Amino acid sequence: MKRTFQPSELKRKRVHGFRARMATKAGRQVLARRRAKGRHSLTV
Amino acid sequence: MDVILLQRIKNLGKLGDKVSVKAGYGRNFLIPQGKAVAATEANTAAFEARRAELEKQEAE
Amino acid sequence: MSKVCQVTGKRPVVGNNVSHANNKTKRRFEPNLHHHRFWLESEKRFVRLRLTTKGMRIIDKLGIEKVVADLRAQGQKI
RNA sequence: CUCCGGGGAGGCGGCAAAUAUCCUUUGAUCCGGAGAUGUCUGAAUGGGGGAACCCACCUACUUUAAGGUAGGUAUUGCAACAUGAAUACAUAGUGUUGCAAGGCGAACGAGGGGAAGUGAAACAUCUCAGUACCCUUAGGAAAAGAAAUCAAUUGAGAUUCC
RNA sequence: UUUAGUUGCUGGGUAUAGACCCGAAACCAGGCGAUCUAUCCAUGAGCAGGUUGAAGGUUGGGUAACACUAACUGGAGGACCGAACCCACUGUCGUUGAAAAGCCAGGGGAUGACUUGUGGAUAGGGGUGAAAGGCUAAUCAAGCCUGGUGAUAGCUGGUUCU
């Protein structure tokens, strides 16, 4: 049966990407939190 | 508003009289058309000291 | 770009509605703002300002030129 | 990598031994200070974009082929200058130059908004509490501050903290 | 009129704090989700084969002219039978399954209110719904994550040497 995850890299980058996060204040706060926690990879 | 005229008005008076006028009449009609100006002490002194004769000269 | 009076600086403030049973809910009080065109002789033109009726009372008492000079000195495009 | 100072026999960073070529008393490795170089992304600022990519223009020098070197080309605010409508003076608009700003980061400060769980042995006034949280913005601290203040024997004498 | 207090140290009790420990269904604030699914927008793609024979047209009959009529053409339809494709009516099996919704044998639609790819829009007391309180990432009579938060529990359990 069809499952929930149907991967598409263009959609992945446009929804969860670095520039998408930079575009809004809440996304910049997300990036700040992840930098403070010390994640090795900030975004997808 | 208290104003002094610079010309003649049919019911108000004429030529330098100080009369009490509703704020709208002065603000929207008289001042922006030059028929009168507000009766500040400086305005009254300036009108009376020099330009009284100058205004009285212009009949029409 | 806001409900702010150009002449006096008034703006909305917050308060409460109080009922007969003393229930309190948040509200705001707004200024009596609106637009008005003033003839300016020194520049031969009409200047349009967003202001309150208290702003008009101040303009009536002080003169339009003095008020415009004060706003320009405060740094507004009039 | 360079210079200056220290030091005086070993050294070629670690996982990580071996090995090779080796460097060094003409002073190495090492330690401290000052300089040189410093790709691409990122406020990213020549335009665009799915970050680390795609596409440009203008000068000066250089090449004879289809290029190379260096510099410049963002926006907004202020100032000077130039240009310039409806419209005659003007203003709006437009451009050049010069200056400044933006972003990040622990807590503490000031300001703009602001709950509910809970307690009241139920609950609406009240409490929780101007707390949690969101937004703007400083400084090494901030804020406040030199009485239109208190006191009540006619006395005290700015603000802050215990 | 009752005539020994007071300040330390240790211990028993009480009060304010999470106050002996573990346990809700909930409520509030700020963020993350339409790669599943619901509806919509733009641009592309798909539907073997066989039947039936609507409107209209031509010709001949028939009328004072109509009207009427026969034959031939013609190819309509949320038309018919039936593969692909899309569904899900019955039964057996499976139920620590091959599978967190299937296989097998039969079944329905199959040119349309049709099926489908790519890219977009709508975000939580909101969305969308040919309407079942259905769906909104295996979660829905109010999604998920992080904070208020160690919420409160007149209830249940547990509570360690002589």
Add this chain to the structure above:
RNA sequence: UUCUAACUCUGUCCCGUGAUCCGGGACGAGGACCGUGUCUGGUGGGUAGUUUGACUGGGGCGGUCUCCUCCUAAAGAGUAA
């Protein structure tokens, strides 16, 4: 009743300007109305927070809930359904 000068136009033309936004100008149609701020009466399950008793031969329905007199009450007092 009339007027225009505040104010309105999701009406026409011109300029910024290469532009169905916007601003300025010229007209036209309205006009002290409409509309907005403060105060105030009405309406208001649209939305929100909550309440909606106990006893009881299970609960609900019915009955009862405070006071006085007699019996049950076992010759002092008190004694339940």
